[PDB]
Amino acid sequence: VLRSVNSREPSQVIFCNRSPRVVLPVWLNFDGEPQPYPTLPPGTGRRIHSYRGHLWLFRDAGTHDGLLVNQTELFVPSLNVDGQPIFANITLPVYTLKERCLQVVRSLVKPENYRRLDIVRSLYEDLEDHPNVQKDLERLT
Amino acid sequence: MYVKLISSDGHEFIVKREHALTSGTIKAMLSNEVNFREIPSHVLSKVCMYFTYKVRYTNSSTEIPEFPIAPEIALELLMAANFLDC
Amino acid sequence: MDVFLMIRRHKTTIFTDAKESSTVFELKRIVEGILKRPPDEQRLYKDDQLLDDGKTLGECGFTSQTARPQAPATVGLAFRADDTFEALCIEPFSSPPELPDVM
Ligand SMILES: CC(=O)N1CCc2cc([N+](=O)[O-])ccc21
């Protein structure tokens, strides 16, 4: 369904990581499967050789928290105009205050111990629902 | 125009209506002043800083900073954020 | 630039913003619109330093680097009861519990 188009038409890209997270680029191959790429340290870049119609999304490499690319969820490299590479501007989203707390708490408590925190049962299920590329790919479809 | 969000321990937080109304819960509790029997002031102050951070960085390519949460307030902020959807 | 402030007196905290070039007195006007008390009945402080009406918030040390949205700078507020000013009193916030063993 949500796949890269096999255009075989080169498109030059700059992944820019304007986030404080280690960014994991995720390419969606031609069968729809997420393919992880080498990670980007915060504020660093990588010129990447992609193709028109291809699908990229970006995640915190450690938590798989979802990032934005050019203020949106999916990045599709387009035609290079005047030979200038395309900029994939990876940024932090404005997470909800709820998601952000789940992030901080997920990062302090080993998941074995989520049930040892004194909070309502809705929050244990929310904590255990880790951000996840598979889940998100369904949401976007 | 401003509203007053009073914490469980008496501190009064005066934020703009636009900021508070971003919360569906607080809009309901306003429809002025709002008392939170369960949110202490070290959590409601963070909530209010989040309203400021949200309104400022919602729809911005000017790279947004991280919203910082001290580890010692994370579990309470979570409970309050879960109760307010914001 | 906008500077993001918590105006604090006693157990009152105003969250608002202002321009770096805005003046202390104009912030006193902003407080007046909210707390319904005239600028002459108020004193604004940076930490413990009493601020001068004619100075901009930037000259008073409030800048985009220090008065940020997610970490706003505090301006102390004191009121004059009748001919005489109270001392600057800012009640601290409640104390978080000890970090659980789980964290
Ligand atoms: C229903 C319920 O449990 N609530 C309501 C909001 C809230 C806040 C805190 N807090 O510590 O900020 C703790 C508990 C709760």
Whole-angstrom distance, CA of residue A59 vs CA of residue A136: 11
For A114, nearest residue in chain C (alpha carbons): C102
Cβ contacts of B70 on chain C, cutoff 8 Å:
96
- Count up the domains in chain C and report the number: 1
Whole-angstrom distance, CA of residue A36 vs CA of residue C23: 52
Cβ contacts of B84 on chain A, cutoff 8 Å:
97
Residue type, A70: N
Answer whether C68 sits within 8 Å of B11, measured CB to CB: no
Residues from B contacting C (CB-CB < 8 Å) are 2, 7-16, 19, 40-42, 45, 48-53, 56-57, 65-68, 70-76
CB B22 within 8 A of CB C39: no
Whole-angstrom distance, CA of residue B84 vs CA of residue B26: 7
- Enclosing H/E stretch for A101: helix A97-106
Answer whether A116 sits within 8 Å of C100, measured CB to CB: yes
Assigned token pair, A26:
């995720």
Answer whether B82 sits within 8 Å of A98, measured CB to CB: yes
Experimental method: X-ray
Whole-angstrom distance, CA of residue C95 vs CA of residue B67: 20
Nearest CA to ligand 1 atom 7: B80
According to DSSP, residue A66 is labeled B
Range of the domain at C59: 2-103
CATH number, position B35: 3.30.710.10
Answer whether A101 sits within 8 Å of B50, measured CB to CB: no
The full DSSP string for B2-61 is EEEEE-TTS-EEEEEHHHHHTSHHHHHHH--EEE-TT--HHHHHHHHHHHHHHHHHTT--
Residue C103 CB contacts under 8 Å (≥ 6 apart), including other chains: A105, A108, A109, B71, B74, B75
C-alpha R_g of chain C = 15
Residues 73-102 of C with CB under 8 A from A: 100-102
H-type alpha helices, chain C: 24-35
Ligand 1 proximal residues by C-beta, below 6 Å: A 120; B 38-39, 43, 76, 79-80, 83
Distance B38 CA to ligand 1 centre (A): 5
Range of the domain at B49: 2-84
Residues from C contacting B (CB-CB < 8 Å) are 2, 4, 6, 11-17, 34, 68-72, 91, 93-100, 103
CATH number, position C101: 3.10.20.90
For B80, nearest residue in chain A (alpha carbons): A98
Assigned token pair, A59:
């995640």
Q: After which residues is chain B discontinuous, taking C to N > 2.5 Å?
A: 31
- Count up the domains in chain B and report the number: 1
Distance B77 CA to ligand 1 centre (A): 8
CA C9, C93, A116 angle in degrees (round to 5)? 165
Distance A81 CA to ligand 1 centre (A): 53
3-class DSSP state of C97: coil
Answer whether A71 sits within 8 Å of B58, measured CB to CB: no
Return the sign of the alpha-carbon dihedral for residues B80, B84, C2, C6: negative
CB A21 within 8 A of CB A40: no
3-class DSSP state of B75: helix
* CA distances (Å), origin A34, targets A38, A47, A88, B76: 13, 20, 18, 35
Separation in Å, CA of C103 to nearest CA in chain A:
5
A4 touches chain B (CB under 8 A): no
Phi, psi of C33 (to 5 degrees): -60, -20
Domains of chain A: 10-92 (2.60.40.780), 97-138 (1.10.750.10)
Phi, psi of C42 (to 5 degrees): -130, 155
CB C32 within 8 A of CB C26: no
Ligand 1, atom nearest to B36 Cα: 6
